[PDB]
Coordinates of N, CA and C in Angstrom, one line a residue:
Chain A
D111 N 9.1 59.1 -81.3 CA 10.7 59.5 -80.7 C 10.8 61.1 -79.9
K112 N 11.5 61.3 -79.4 CA 11.2 63.0 -78.3 C 12.5 63.3 -79.0
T113 N 12.3 64.7 -79.4 CA 13.6 65.4 -80.1 C 13.0 67.0 -80.0
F114 N 13.2 67.7 -78.5 CA 12.5 69.0 -78.4 C 13.0 70.3 -79.1
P115 N 12.4 70.8 -79.7 CA 12.9 71.9 -80.6 C 13.4 73.0 -79.9
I116 N 14.1 74.1 -80.3 CA 14.6 75.4 -79.4 C 13.6 76.4 -79.7
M117 N 13.2 77.1 -79.2 CA 12.4 78.3 -78.8 C 13.3 79.7 -79.4
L118 N 13.0 80.8 -80.3 CA 13.5 82.2 -79.7 C 12.8 83.1 -80.5
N119 N 12.2 83.5 -79.7 CA 10.5 84.5 -79.9 C 9.8 83.9 -80.9
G120 N 9.2 82.8 -80.5 CA 8.1 82.1 -81.4 C 9.0 81.0 -82.5
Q121 N 9.5 81.9 -83.1 CA 10.2 81.0 -84.6 C 11.3 79.8 -84.1
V122 N 10.9 78.5 -84.7 CA 11.9 77.3 -84.6 C 13.4 77.6 -85.2
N123 N 14.5 77.8 -84.5 CA 15.4 77.6 -85.4 C 16.4 76.4 -85.0
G124 N 16.2 75.6 -83.9 CA 17.1 75.1 -83.6 C 16.6 73.4 -83.1
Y125 N 16.9 72.3 -82.9 CA 16.4 70.9 -82.2 C 17.3 70.6 -81.1
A126 N 16.6 70.2 -80.0 CA 17.8 69.5 -79.1 C 17.1 67.9 -78.9
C127 N 18.3 67.0 -78.6 CA 17.9 65.4 -78.9 C 18.5 65.0 -77.7
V128 N 17.6 63.9 -77.5 CA 18.0 63.0 -76.0 C 18.5 61.8 -76.3
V129 N 19.8 61.4 -75.5 CA 20.2 60.0 -76.1 C 20.8 59.4 -74.6
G130 N 21.0 57.9 -74.3 CA 20.9 57.4 -73.4 C 22.1 58.1 -72.4
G131 N 21.7 58.7 -71.3 CA 22.5 59.0 -70.4 C 22.7 60.9 -70.7
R132 N 22.4 61.3 -71.5 CA 22.8 62.8 -71.9 C 21.8 63.5 -72.6
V133 N 21.7 64.5 -73.2 CA 21.1 65.5 -73.6 C 22.5 66.3 -74.4
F134 N 21.9 66.7 -76.2 CA 22.3 67.4 -76.7 C 21.8 68.8 -77.2
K135 N 22.6 69.7 -77.6 CA 22.3 71.0 -78.3 C 23.1 71.7 -79.0
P136 N 22.9 71.7 -80.4 CA 24.4 72.5 -81.2 C 24.5 74.0 -80.8
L137 N 25.4 74.4 -81.1 CA 25.9 75.7 -81.0 C 26.0 76.9 -81.4
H138 N 25.4 76.4 -82.7 CA 25.1 77.6 -83.5 C 23.9 78.2 -83.9
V139 N 23.0 78.1 -82.7 CA 21.7 78.7 -82.5 C 21.9 79.2 -81.3
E140 N 21.0 80.3 -80.5 CA 20.9 80.7 -79.2 C 19.2 80.6 -79.4
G141 N 18.4 80.7 -78.2 CA 17.3 80.2 -77.7 C 17.1 79.3 -76.4
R142 N 15.9 79.4 -76.5 CA 15.4 78.7 -74.6 C 14.5 77.4 -74.9
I143 N 15.0 76.1 -74.3 CA 13.7 75.1 -74.8 C 12.8 75.2 -74.1
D144 N 11.6 75.1 -74.9 CA 10.2 75.2 -74.0 C 9.8 74.3 -73.0
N145 N 10.7 73.0 -73.1 CA 10.3 72.3 -71.8 C 11.2 73.1 -70.5
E146 N 10.4 72.8 -69.8 CA 10.9 73.1 -68.2 C 11.9 72.5 -67.2
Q147 N 11.5 71.2 -67.7 CA 12.7 70.1 -67.1 C 13.7 70.3 -68.0
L148 N 14.1 70.9 -69.3 CA 15.4 70.9 -70.3 C 15.9 72.0 -70.1
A149 N 15.2 73.0 -69.1 CA 15.6 74.5 -69.1 C 16.8 74.8 -67.8
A150 N 16.4 73.8 -66.9 CA 17.0 74.5 -65.7 C 18.3 73.4 -65.3
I151 N 18.8 72.6 -66.7 CA 19.9 72.0 -66.9 C 21.0 73.1 -67.0
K152 N 22.3 72.7 -66.4 CA 23.6 73.7 -66.8 C 24.0 73.1 -68.1
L153 N 23.6 73.4 -69.1 CA 24.0 72.9 -70.3 C 25.6 73.7 -70.5
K154 N 26.6 72.9 -70.5 CA 28.1 73.6 -70.6 C 28.4 73.6 -71.9
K155 N 29.1 74.4 -72.3 CA 29.7 74.7 -73.5 C 31.1 73.9 -73.9
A156 N 31.5 73.8 -75.3 CA 32.6 72.8 -75.6 C 33.0 73.1 -76.6
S157 N 34.0 72.1 -77.4 CA 34.4 72.1 -78.6 C 33.8 71.7 -80.0
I158 N 34.1 71.6 -81.1 CA 33.4 70.6 -82.3 C 32.9 69.2 -81.8
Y159 N 33.4 68.6 -80.4 CA 32.9 67.4 -80.1 C 31.8 67.8 -79.6
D160 N 31.2 68.6 -79.5 CA 30.0 69.0 -78.7 C 29.4 68.3 -77.5
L161 N 30.2 68.5 -76.3 CA 29.9 68.1 -74.8 C 28.9 68.8 -74.2
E162 N 27.7 68.1 -74.0 CA 26.8 69.1 -73.3 C 26.5 68.0 -71.6
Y163 N 25.5 68.3 -70.9 CA 25.2 67.5 -69.7 C 23.8 67.1 -69.8
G164 N 24.0 65.7 -69.0 CA 22.8 65.0 -69.1 C 22.1 65.2 -67.6
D165 N 21.8 66.5 -67.2 CA 21.8 66.2 -65.6 C 20.5 66.0 -65.3
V166 N 19.2 65.5 -66.4 CA 18.2 65.5 -65.9 C 18.1 64.0 -65.5
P167 N 17.2 63.1 -64.4 CA 17.4 62.3 -64.0 C 17.0 60.9 -64.6
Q168 N 16.7 59.5 -64.3 CA 17.0 58.2 -64.9 C 15.2 58.2 -65.6
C169 N 14.2 58.4 -64.9 CA 12.5 58.2 -64.9 C 12.4 58.8 -66.4
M170 N 13.4 59.5 -67.2 CA 12.7 59.7 -68.9 C 14.0 59.6 -69.4
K171 N 15.2 59.2 -69.1 CA 16.4 59.0 -69.8 C 16.0 57.8 -70.6
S172 N 17.2 57.7 -71.3 CA 17.4 57.0 -72.5 C 15.8 56.9 -73.3
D173 N 15.4 57.9 -74.1 CA 14.5 57.6 -75.1 C 15.3 56.9 -76.4
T174 N 16.3 57.6 -76.7 CA 17.1 56.6 -78.1 C 18.3 55.9 -77.7
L175 N 18.7 54.9 -78.3 CA 20.0 54.9 -78.0 C 21.4 55.0 -79.0
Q176 N 22.5 54.9 -78.8 CA 23.4 55.9 -79.8 C 23.9 54.8 -80.3
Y177 N 24.5 54.5 -81.8 CA 24.7 53.6 -82.6 C 26.3 52.9 -82.0
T178 N 26.4 51.5 -82.1 CA 27.3 50.8 -81.8 C 28.3 50.7 -82.9
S179 N 29.3 49.8 -83.0 CA 30.1 49.4 -84.0 C 29.6 49.0 -85.1
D180 N 30.5 48.8 -85.8 CA 30.0 47.9 -87.4 C 28.9 48.5 -88.2
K181 N 29.5 49.5 -88.7 CA 28.8 50.5 -89.6 C 28.7 50.1 -91.1
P182 N 27.6 49.9 -91.7 CA 27.6 49.5 -92.9 C 27.1 50.5 -93.6
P183 N 27.3 50.7 -94.8 CA 26.8 51.7 -95.7 C 25.2 52.0 -96.5
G184 N 24.5 50.9 -95.4 CA 23.3 50.6 -96.1 C 22.3 51.7 -95.5
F185 N 21.0 51.4 -95.5 CA 20.1 52.1 -95.1 C 20.3 52.6 -93.7
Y186 N 20.0 54.2 -93.7 CA 19.6 55.2 -92.5 C 18.6 55.8 -92.6
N187 N 18.0 56.3 -91.5 CA 16.6 56.7 -91.6 C 16.6 58.2 -91.4
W188 N 15.9 59.1 -91.4 CA 15.8 60.3 -91.6 C 14.4 61.0 -91.3
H189 N 14.4 62.2 -91.1 CA 13.4 63.4 -90.8 C 12.5 63.3 -92.0
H190 N 13.5 63.9 -93.0 CA 13.0 64.3 -94.6 C 12.6 62.9 -95.2
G191 N 13.6 61.8 -95.0 CA 13.6 60.9 -96.1 C 14.7 59.6 -95.4
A192 N 15.6 59.4 -96.5 CA 16.7 58.4 -96.0 C 17.9 59.0 -96.4
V193 N 18.6 58.1 -95.9 CA 20.1 58.6 -96.3 C 21.1 57.4 -96.3
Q194 N 22.0 56.9 -97.4 CA 22.8 55.7 -97.4 C 24.1 55.5 -97.8
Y195 N 25.0 56.4 -96.3 CA 26.4 56.4 -96.7 C 26.9 56.6 -95.3
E196 N 27.9 56.1 -95.2 CA 29.1 55.9 -93.7 C 30.5 56.8 -93.9
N197 N 30.6 57.1 -94.6 CA 32.5 57.9 -94.9 C 31.6 59.3 -95.0
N198 N 30.8 59.4 -95.6 CA 30.4 60.6 -95.9 C 28.7 60.8 -95.6
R199 N 28.1 61.8 -96.2 CA 26.4 61.9 -96.1 C 25.8 61.9 -97.3
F200 N 24.7 61.1 -97.5 CA 24.1 61.1 -98.6 C 23.7 62.4 -99.5
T201 N 23.6 62.4 -100.6 CA 23.2 63.3 -101.6 C 22.1 63.4 -101.5
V202 N 21.2 64.1 -100.4 CA 19.7 64.1 -100.3 C 19.5 65.4 -101.4
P203 N 18.0 65.0 -101.7 CA 17.5 66.2 -102.7 C 17.2 67.4 -101.9
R204 N 16.5 68.3 -102.6 CA 16.5 69.5 -102.2 C 15.0 69.2 -101.3
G205 N 14.4 70.6 -100.8 CA 13.3 70.9 -99.8 C 14.4 70.7 -98.3
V206 N 15.0 69.4 -98.0 CA 15.9 69.5 -97.0 C 17.2 70.1 -97.1
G207 N 17.3 71.1 -96.6 CA 18.6 72.0 -96.8 C 18.0 73.2 -96.7
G208 N 17.1 73.5 -95.6 CA 16.6 74.9 -95.5 C 17.1 76.0 -94.4
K209 N 16.7 76.0 -93.1 CA 16.9 76.8 -92.1 C 16.7 76.1 -90.7
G210 N 17.3 76.0 -89.6 CA 17.1 75.5 -88.5 C 16.6 74.3 -88.2
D211 N 17.4 73.5 -89.4 CA 17.1 71.9 -89.4 C 18.4 71.4 -88.6
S212 N 19.0 72.1 -88.0 CA 20.5 71.4 -86.9 C 20.1 70.8 -86.0
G213 N 20.9 70.0 -85.4 CA 20.1 69.0 -84.6 C 19.3 67.8 -84.5
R214 N 19.0 67.7 -85.8 CA 17.7 66.5 -86.3 C 18.6 65.0 -86.1
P215 N 18.2 64.2 -85.1 CA 19.2 62.8 -85.6 C 18.9 62.2 -86.8
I216 N 20.0 61.6 -87.3 CA 20.0 60.4 -88.3 C 19.9 59.2 -87.6
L217 N 18.8 58.2 -87.9 CA 18.9 57.2 -87.1 C 19.0 55.8 -87.8
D218 N 19.3 54.2 -87.4 CA 19.5 53.5 -88.3 C 17.8 52.8 -88.4
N219 N 18.0 51.6 -89.2 CA 16.9 51.0 -89.1 C 16.2 50.7 -87.7
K220 N 16.9 50.2 -86.6 CA 16.3 49.7 -85.6 C 16.1 50.9 -84.7
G221 N 16.0 51.8 -85.1 CA 15.9 53.2 -84.3 C 16.8 53.6 -83.5
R222 N 17.9 53.4 -83.6 CA 19.0 53.6 -83.1 C 19.8 54.9 -83.6
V223 N 20.2 56.1 -83.2 CA 20.7 57.3 -83.6 C 22.0 57.1 -83.7
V224 N 22.6 57.7 -85.3 CA 24.2 57.3 -85.6 C 24.4 58.9 -85.4
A225 N 23.7 59.5 -86.3 CA 24.5 61.0 -86.3 C 23.8 62.2 -86.4
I226 N 24.1 63.0 -86.1 CA 23.3 64.8 -85.5 C 23.7 65.4 -86.2
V227 N 23.1 66.4 -87.0 CA 23.5 67.3 -88.5 C 23.6 68.6 -87.7
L228 N 24.5 69.6 -88.5 CA 24.7 70.9 -87.9 C 25.2 71.8 -89.2
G229 N 25.1 71.3 -90.6 CA 25.4 72.0 -91.8 C 25.5 71.3 -93.1
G230 N 25.7 72.5 -94.0 CA 25.6 71.9 -95.2 C 24.2 71.9 -96.0
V231 N 24.1 73.5 -96.1 CA 22.9 73.8 -96.4 C 22.6 73.2 -97.8
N232 N 23.4 73.6 -98.9 CA 23.3 73.2 -100.3 C 24.6 73.5 -101.3
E233 N 24.9 72.2 -101.5 CA 26.3 72.2 -102.2 C 26.1 71.4 -103.8
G234 N 25.1 71.9 -104.3 CA 25.1 71.9 -106.2 C 23.7 70.8 -106.0
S235 N 24.1 70.1 -106.9 CA 23.2 68.9 -107.1 C 23.4 67.6 -106.0
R236 N 24.4 67.8 -105.4 CA 24.6 67.0 -104.4 C 25.0 67.8 -103.0
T237 N 24.0 67.4 -102.1 CA 24.0 68.2 -100.9 C 24.6 67.2 -99.7
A238 N 25.7 67.6 -99.1 CA 26.5 67.2 -98.3 C 26.0 67.3 -96.7
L239 N 25.8 66.8 -95.5 CA 25.6 67.2 -94.6 C 26.8 66.9 -93.4
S240 N 27.2 68.2 -92.6 CA 28.4 68.2 -91.4 C 27.7 67.6 -90.6
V241 N 28.0 66.4 -90.1 CA 27.5 65.7 -88.5 C 28.5 65.6 -87.9
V242 N 28.4 64.8 -86.9 CA 29.1 64.4 -85.3 C 28.7 62.7 -85.6
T243 N 29.9 61.5 -85.5 CA 29.9 60.4 -85.4 C 30.9 59.8 -84.5
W244 N 31.1 58.6 -84.3 CA 32.1 57.9 -83.8 C 32.7 57.2 -84.9
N245 N 34.4 57.2 -84.8 CA 34.8 57.0 -86.2 C 35.3 55.4 -86.2
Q246 N 36.0 54.9 -85.2 CA 36.1 53.7 -85.5 C 36.2 52.6 -84.1
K247 N 36.2 53.0 -83.3 CA 36.5 53.0 -81.6 C 35.7 53.4 -80.7
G248 N 34.7 54.5 -81.0 CA 33.7 54.9 -80.3 C 34.0 56.5 -80.0
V249 N 35.2 56.7 -80.4 CA 35.8 57.5 -80.0 C 35.3 59.3 -81.0
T250 N 34.0 60.0 -80.7 CA 33.4 61.1 -80.9 C 33.8 62.1 -81.8
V251 N 34.1 62.2 -83.2 CA 34.9 62.9 -83.9 C 33.6 63.9 -85.0
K252 N 33.9 64.9 -85.2 CA 33.3 66.1 -86.2 C 33.6 65.8 -87.5
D253 N 32.7 65.4 -88.4 CA 33.0 65.8 -89.9 C 32.4 66.6 -90.4
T254 N 33.2 67.1 -91.6 CA 32.7 68.7 -92.0 C 33.1 68.2 -93.4
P255 N 32.3 68.3 -94.5 CA 32.9 68.5 -96.0 C 33.2 69.9 -96.3
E256 N 33.8 70.4 -97.6 CA 34.0 71.3 -97.8 C 32.7 72.4 -98.2
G257 N 33.2 73.7 -97.8 CA 31.7 74.7 -97.7 C 30.6 74.6 -97.1
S258 N 31.0 74.1 -95.8 CA 29.6 73.5 -95.2 C 29.2 74.9 -94.4
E259 N 28.3 75.6 -94.7 CA 27.7 76.7 -93.8 C 26.9 75.7 -92.8
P260 N 27.0 77.0 -91.6 CA 26.1 76.5 -90.6 C 24.8 76.5 -90.9
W261 N 24.0 75.1 -90.6 CA 22.7 75.3 -91.1 C 21.9 74.1 -90.0
Chain B
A393 N 89.3 102.9 -52.4 CA 89.3 101.6 -52.6 C 90.3 101.2 -53.5
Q394 N 91.0 100.3 -53.6 CA 92.1 100.1 -54.7 C 91.2 99.2 -55.8
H395 N 90.4 98.4 -55.3 CA 89.7 97.9 -56.7 C 88.4 98.8 -57.0
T396 N 87.7 97.9 -58.2 CA 86.7 98.8 -58.7 C 85.2 97.8 -58.5
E397 N 84.3 98.3 -57.9 CA 83.1 97.9 -58.0 C 82.2 97.3 -59.2
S398 N 81.9 95.9 -59.5 CA 81.3 95.3 -60.6 C 79.6 95.1 -60.2
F399 N 78.9 94.6 -61.4 CA 77.6 94.2 -61.0 C 77.6 92.8 -60.2
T400 N 78.0 91.8 -60.9 CA 78.3 90.6 -60.2 C 79.4 90.1 -59.1
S401 N 79.9 91.1 -58.6 CA 80.7 91.0 -57.4 C 80.3 90.5 -56.3
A402 N 78.8 90.9 -56.3 CA 78.3 90.4 -54.8 C 77.7 89.2 -54.8
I403 N 77.5 88.2 -55.9 CA 76.6 87.1 -56.1 C 77.8 86.0 -55.7
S404 N 77.0 85.4 -54.8 CA 78.1 84.0 -54.2 C 77.6 82.9 -55.1
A405 N 77.6 82.0 -54.7 CA 77.6 80.5 -55.2 C 76.1 80.2 -54.7
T406 N 75.4 80.4 -53.9 CA 74.3 79.6 -53.7 C 73.2 80.5 -53.9
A407 N 73.9 82.2 -54.1 CA 72.5 83.1 -54.7 C 72.5 83.1 -56.1
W408 N 73.8 82.6 -56.5 CA 73.6 82.2 -58.1 C 72.8 80.4 -58.4
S409 N 73.3 79.8 -57.8 CA 72.4 78.7 -57.8 C 71.1 78.9 -57.6
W410 N 70.6 79.7 -56.8 CA 68.9 80.0 -56.2 C 68.5 80.5 -57.4
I411 N 69.2 81.5 -57.9 CA 68.1 82.3 -59.1 C 68.0 81.4 -60.3
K412 N 69.1 80.6 -60.8 CA 69.1 79.7 -61.8 C 68.0 78.5 -61.7
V413 N 68.1 78.3 -60.4 CA 67.0 77.0 -60.1 C 65.7 77.8 -60.2
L414 N 65.0 78.8 -59.9 CA 63.5 79.7 -60.1 C 63.6 80.0 -61.5
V415 N 64.7 80.2 -62.2 CA 64.6 80.7 -64.0 C 64.4 79.2 -64.7
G416 N 65.1 78.2 -64.1 CA 64.5 76.7 -64.7 C 63.3 76.1 -64.4
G417 N 63.1 76.6 -63.5 CA 61.5 75.7 -62.8 C 60.2 76.6 -63.4
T418 N 60.5 77.8 -63.7 CA 59.3 78.5 -64.3 C 59.2 78.1 -66.0
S419 N 60.5 78.0 -66.6 CA 60.9 77.7 -68.0 C 60.6 76.3 -68.0
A420 N 60.5 75.1 -67.1 CA 60.3 74.0 -67.5 C 58.7 73.6 -67.2
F421 N 57.8 74.3 -66.5 CA 56.3 74.2 -66.3 C 55.8 74.8 -67.6
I422 N 56.5 76.1 -68.3 CA 55.9 76.1 -69.2 C 55.9 75.5 -70.9
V423 N 57.3 74.6 -70.4 CA 57.6 73.7 -71.7 C 56.6 72.4 -71.5
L424 N 56.5 72.1 -70.2 CA 55.7 71.4 -70.0 C 54.0 71.2 -70.3
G425 N 53.7 72.3 -70.2 CA 52.4 72.6 -70.9 C 52.3 73.1 -72.5
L426 N 53.4 73.4 -72.5 CA 53.6 73.3 -74.1 C 53.6 72.1 -75.0
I427 N 54.4 71.3 -74.5 CA 54.4 69.9 -75.3 C 52.7 69.2 -74.9
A428 N 52.3 69.4 -73.9 CA 51.0 68.6 -73.9 C 49.8 69.2 -74.7
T429 N 50.0 70.4 -74.7 CA 49.2 71.6 -75.4 C 49.1 70.9 -77.2
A430 N 50.3 70.5 -77.6 CA 50.5 70.1 -79.2 C 50.3 68.8 -79.4
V431 N 50.6 68.0 -77.8 CA 50.3 66.4 -77.9 C 48.4 66.6 -78.3
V432 N 47.7 66.5 -77.8 CA 46.5 66.2 -77.7 C 45.7 67.1 -79.3
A433 N 46.5 67.8 -79.6 CA 46.1 68.5 -81.0 C 46.5 67.3 -82.2
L434 N 47.6 66.5 -82.0 CA 47.9 65.5 -82.4 C 46.7 64.1 -82.5
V435 N 46.2 63.9 -81.3 CA 45.2 62.5 -80.9 C 44.3 63.1 -81.3
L436 N 43.7 64.8 -81.4 CA 42.7 65.4 -82.1 C 42.4 65.0 -83.5
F437 N 43.5 65.5 -84.1 CA 44.1 65.4 -85.8 C 44.0 63.9 -86.3
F438 N 44.2 62.9 -85.1 CA 44.3 61.4 -85.7 C 42.9 60.3 -85.2
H439 N 42.1 61.1 -84.5 CA 40.8 60.6 -84.4 C 40.0 60.6 -85.7
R440 N 40.1 61.8 -86.5 CA 38.9 61.6 -87.7 C 39.6 61.2 -88.6
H441 N 41.2 60.9 -89.0 CA 41.6 59.9 -89.7 C 42.7 59.2 -89.4

């Protein structure tokens, strides 16, 4: 897959993903993307719905496809492991839940991205993730559980 | 003068109708914006659930 991270004085603190037709970047981090083609794009700020601008042309566009409707609570893949939850996000164990893991995409079995994480460091024995998704008819919403620190 | 001047002695009919048009026009533009500002907060609160 293609998910370029965000640099700030050498250390890694953010991740930027590429979807079909657009690029994404979380607002809780500051830094410059190391890709030169991904640095001259006018990334415009937005609300919690996280609107960015995919001004890059077609010839590298659509590395991955956003998820369609009919979302089960079944298996979903993750960079550190797996998640099986649709209404909320799964109680993944420790290790994941550090710092700088914002923007890492959550994908299905067929390589299609479902959600993009933004928070939820550690909520005890059960760890929740504050992600964005499409609720019922493709309208992009933001879900945040209680006490979700920016992660 | 036999009479006495007041504040509203000089205001004619068309002068009073002109300022109440401009009072009502700018107050209508504000409540048009204020209606639409709280409408989209309801549909943003309804897309989540």
